[PDB]
């Protein structure tokens, strides 16, 4: 036979192993087909009945959760599209920290509806117009269905039963109990000030008994080892130092020169002298447990003993400044004895076992403290890692709602009612954008749809009875999950709800990812490296 | 030989019979190679 | 087609068939340690890629030697570890009830039925089964100082009654419980030492309150020096005693033959100060951390004194424990009150090597067992099952609850979630009843393994737990069933508590897995 | 649901496994296999093994502990008699 030889120009110079895509069929409809398979990967982990996963990554790691960031970033995406959508859900954790999956199911189908308009005869830019009017729409609309807001952020019971639901997302049956310990957690470190640090509470997870026997503690824990005689003190006066335990030297290289024999035997008794003046100086003013971050010398243990001094020497940078924190005290970047200022204070310092860990302890009695640490039990490491997931996104929630104090229901009920009032408003509108308005309504019946076949049921009828009781000026009723036939409850009594401003950020970046994604014409990759 | 092997590859071993002619053939041909250099009139 | 979404070589499967899969996979893994549960259990052989060989009967030892890579196999290897770190025994029977669950529930998973309401069965059941161990277990608030040690007794006997030492657990159920309420109140681990020295028979292990290690490096003059004290006084040091440069960063500039000579004479007038500040202070016997010199050998061995040098951390700690002084790395402030003391002090042959021996100690918060036997791995089993026996007195020192054992608890867990099932229902009653009826895997393996017929003595089981006898479990010796709480075979409540709940969480967490992904290489 | 072969050990396809009562006959087998080897060396009018090491040096002995010290062995049991010599002498 013969061969089609090539085309002059571009295709004759084109390098060895560069793909060059051009034109709506082999461009656009290919990248649509990958954002729609990328959806449909991730669509099955959505909603309080979602099925746990499995990843393995490159390095033979095991990961069980239903977190779409987590399972998004232990997978490996070769596709330019599917990155972009996975950059867009990685930015919507940054900013909020809950609402990973609404982006991708959204995108998703917001991508699938813009492809059968292109398919009829409507160009991407009308495409394109249609979904941003439709989007600034939304934005208007949806204040108008803010209920319930937050009353008061230092009410243990009204904390728990705004973060009920956020856990309740993805530990079902374990909820009440995951938010009353992360109610008191979040109450106990709230300052006067509304500034509220994520990173003041810390988590420590313990092999052992089940998940019923987690607790929180008004203080620091480390899986350490005290290094002295000393294990146990009853009102504690710390001191904190930076520099090691030991006695100095130059900077410059030193050495120590000697012409006779009197300071040949006088050196080594003069140095003890000074390390034992040094550690009783620091033991007069009353401190009783010493911390350091470096070395500590054995005569420095001795005298240490000696004295009735606790060491404990722990070795992170930042686990030192958090101890400081919460003690109230100032790291010495040189040994000397402390001034009352600089002095911290706590209650009880001492060593423990729990469950094959040898751990160390500094608690206090008081309710606000500066931190509070978590320690969670459990029988797999796998499950304290998802216990901890759970745990970082009640407390992201709760720092959400100290920024603001809005509420909207959930459940698909602002789902109905923003497609809905979308839909009407683009039935007025005259002109070839009324397609995309409209295209735009009906993307937002894919998250109660995905909880509907999720649970189990038949989607379609669960959708229309929702419509024909939202007709009737009902805008608080959604999706029922504890019945096994398609129903709908009233939201607001059953006090399902989420936060404003993590719908508002969802709806935002899916849009602007959707319409990036649509903007591209051709595409010209390098062989890979 | 049982069917159970109690020796690493290359270990080997010799029972009654085969030990006594091994043992006896190497002490002969020793003898015997160095039997010609006796006597005055031996060689070399 | 022409770009794919993720690399090439990524494997998923989803549905029914990938947790079908998981579900076969634990029965292999349950399989693999059947045969080591009861009185009448075998045990293992395991070799390893250099030919070093594992003796063991242990189920978390077992599967710690498996290399299992199967990601669902994988939850009951974590689970026996768990068990084992939290309580120390029962790690075969969580593996097999996890498997019996999953076992159980496997045709209803086949018949397209939710995994959601199978979880919330099995937390229902795990909750009842949990209240109702609490409620039915025996304790004895004010009860003795003397039958607070017959129930440890009778707990360790029961632990030691499957393991390779079975016929002498009278023998070491005495030491053990010794060995227990010898230690402080923390009950540090550490604090009890293990030495194993071949040769001998079993019956000659024994247990020194005191202290016991091995013979250390010698040098020249260590044979001229005494063996045997009666009331010495003991110092512990970290000072290292031998002629030496005095610092690394040191260096000497001298000009004149006298101030060299002076120079010369000042180290052996250092080295013998320290000597001499020892000797002075009355200690007969010395160690050190550190090593000790053969002039410091010499000159000890010239005044009737015993040193010794390079010791372990842990068992010089051991001994400051027992004797009572405290460690120096200064010997310019020898004092009394930092001399260790003890009533008799050896060193003896044992098995071909040299012991030294504290002993007479009456204060002392610590203890060191001599363990004989005829091989490594004997000797390392005997370590294993002396582990297990510790730790079971240790939580029953903390908690004093106890059940009889031999299937009677789990025939009548069984009995109450069958009769609760019956109350309710739905697909709750069929669930409630498989978790109901996966319990007396316990009692069938104990028969299977015995060589019984154990569908006949599980009828006479279930016959006599419903007619009103809520202790009555398999008798192993008679053939039949006997009440295991007037036989002696007892247990603390924690073993089977903590045994429910972690086989349970790990039966729900592979039944909630929906598909598994594998990523390149 | 097609259970096809699925990996649950690493090296699976390589590695064997004996249970049963063959074990239990293979272990006696060298256990026998031992004690007949070292039968001849009994008494007053035994005869002596003569070892060759790895380098290639003659030993000739009647000491049974030595004997079994320097036979190199692959069988778990064999090593375990071996052991046994070992602690006894
Ligand atoms: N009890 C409940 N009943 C109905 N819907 C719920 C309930 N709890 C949470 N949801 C819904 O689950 C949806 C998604 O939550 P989730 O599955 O955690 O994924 P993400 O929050 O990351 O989008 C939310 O829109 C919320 O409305
Ligand atoms: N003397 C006995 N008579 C009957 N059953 C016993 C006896 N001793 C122990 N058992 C049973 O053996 C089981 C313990 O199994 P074992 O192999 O020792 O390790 P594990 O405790 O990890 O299962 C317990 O369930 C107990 O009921
Ligand atoms: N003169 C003798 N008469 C009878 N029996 C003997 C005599 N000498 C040794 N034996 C027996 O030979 C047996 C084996 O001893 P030996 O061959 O020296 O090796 P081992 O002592 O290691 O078994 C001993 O049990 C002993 O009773
Ligand atoms: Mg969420
Ligand atoms: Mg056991």
Known sequence: ?529 | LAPVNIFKAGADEERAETARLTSFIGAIAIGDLVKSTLGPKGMD | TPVILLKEGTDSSQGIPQLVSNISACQVIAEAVRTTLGPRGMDKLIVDGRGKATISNDGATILKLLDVVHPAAKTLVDIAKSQDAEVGDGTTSVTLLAAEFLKQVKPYVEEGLHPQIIIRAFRTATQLAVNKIKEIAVTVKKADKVEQRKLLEKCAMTALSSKLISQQKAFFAKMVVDAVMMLDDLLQLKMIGIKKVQGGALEDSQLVAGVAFKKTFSYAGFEMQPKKYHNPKIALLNVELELKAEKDNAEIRVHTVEDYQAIVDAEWNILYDKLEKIHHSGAKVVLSKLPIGDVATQYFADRDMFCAGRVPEEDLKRTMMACGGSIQTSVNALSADVLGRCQVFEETQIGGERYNFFTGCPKAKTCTFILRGGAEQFMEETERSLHDAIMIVRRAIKNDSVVAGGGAIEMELSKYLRDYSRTIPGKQQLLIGAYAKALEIIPRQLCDNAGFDATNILNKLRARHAQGGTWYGVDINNEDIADNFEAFVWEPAMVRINALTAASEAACLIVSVDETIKNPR | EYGRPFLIIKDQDRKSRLMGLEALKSHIMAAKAVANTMRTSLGPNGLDKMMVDKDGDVTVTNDGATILSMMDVDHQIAKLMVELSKSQD
């Open chain 1, 1 to 529: 036979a013969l061969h089609v030889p090539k085309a002059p120009g571009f295709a004759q110079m084109l390098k060895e192993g560069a793909k060059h895509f051009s034109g709506l069929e082999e461009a656009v409809y290919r990248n649509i087909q990958a954002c729609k398979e990328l959806a449909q990967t991730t669509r099955t982990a959505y909603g309080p009945n979602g099925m746990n996963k499995m990843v393995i990554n490159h390095l033979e790691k095991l990961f069980v959760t239903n977190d779409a960031a987590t399972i998004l970033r232990e997978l490996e995406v070769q596709h330019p599209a599917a990155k972009m959508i996975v950059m867009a859900s990685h930015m919507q954790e940054q900013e909020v920290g809950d609402g990973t999956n609404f982006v991708l199911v959204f995108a998703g189908a917001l991508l699938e509806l813009a492809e059968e308009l292109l398919r009829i005869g409507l160009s991407v830019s009308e495409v394109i117009e249609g979904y941003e009017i439709a989007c600034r729409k939304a934005h208007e609309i949806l204040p108008n269905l803010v209920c319930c807001s937050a009353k008061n952020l230092r009410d243990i019971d009204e904390v728990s039963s705004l973060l009920r639901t956020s856990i309740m997302s993805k530990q079902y049956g374990n909820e009440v109990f995951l938010a009353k310990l992360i109610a008191q957690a979040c109450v106990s470190i709230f300052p006067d000030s509304g500034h509220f640090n994520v990173d003041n509470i810390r988590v420590c997870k313990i092999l052992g008994s089940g998940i019923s026997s987690s607790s929180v503690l008004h203080g620091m824990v480390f899986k350490k080892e005290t290094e002295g005689d000393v294990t146990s003190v009853k009102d504690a006066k710390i001191a904190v130092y930076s520099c090691p335990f030991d006695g100095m030297i130059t900077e410059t290289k030193g050495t120590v020169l000697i012409k006779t024999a009197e300071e040949l035997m006088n050196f080594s008794k003069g140095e003890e002298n000074l390390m034992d003046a040094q550690v009783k100086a620091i033991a007069d003013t009353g401190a009783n447990v010493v911390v350091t971050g470096g070395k500590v010398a054995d005569m420095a243990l001795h005298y240490a003993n000696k004295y009735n001094i606790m060491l404990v020497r722990l070795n992170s940078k930042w686990d030192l400044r958090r101890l400081c924190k919460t003690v109230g005290a100032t790291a010495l970047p040189r040994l000397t004895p402390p001034v009352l200022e600089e002095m911290g204070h706590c209650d009880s310092v001492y060593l423990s076992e729990v469950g094959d860990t040898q751990v160390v302890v500094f608690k206090h009695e008081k309710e606000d403290g500066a931190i509070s640490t978590i320690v969670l039990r459990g029988s797999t490491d796998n499950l304290m890692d998802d216990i901890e997931r759970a745990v970082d996104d009640g407390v992201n929630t709760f720092k959400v709602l100290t920024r603001d104090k809005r509420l909207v229901p959930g459940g698909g009920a602002t789902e109905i009612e923003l497609a809905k009032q979308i839909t009407s408003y683009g039935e007025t509108c005259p002109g070839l954008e009324q397609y995309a308005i409209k295209k735009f309504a009906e993307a937002f019946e894919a998250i109660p749809r995905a909880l509907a076949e999720n649970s189990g049921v038949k989607a379609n009828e669960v959708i229309s009875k929702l419509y024909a009781v939202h007709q009737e000026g009902n805008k608080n009723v959604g999706l029922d999950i504890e019945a096994e036939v398609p129903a709908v409850k009233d939201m607001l009594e059953a006090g399902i709800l989420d936060t404003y401003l993590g719908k508002y950020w969802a709806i935002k970046l899916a849009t602007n990812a959707a319409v990036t994604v649509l903007r591209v014409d051709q595409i010209i990759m390098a062989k890979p490296a």
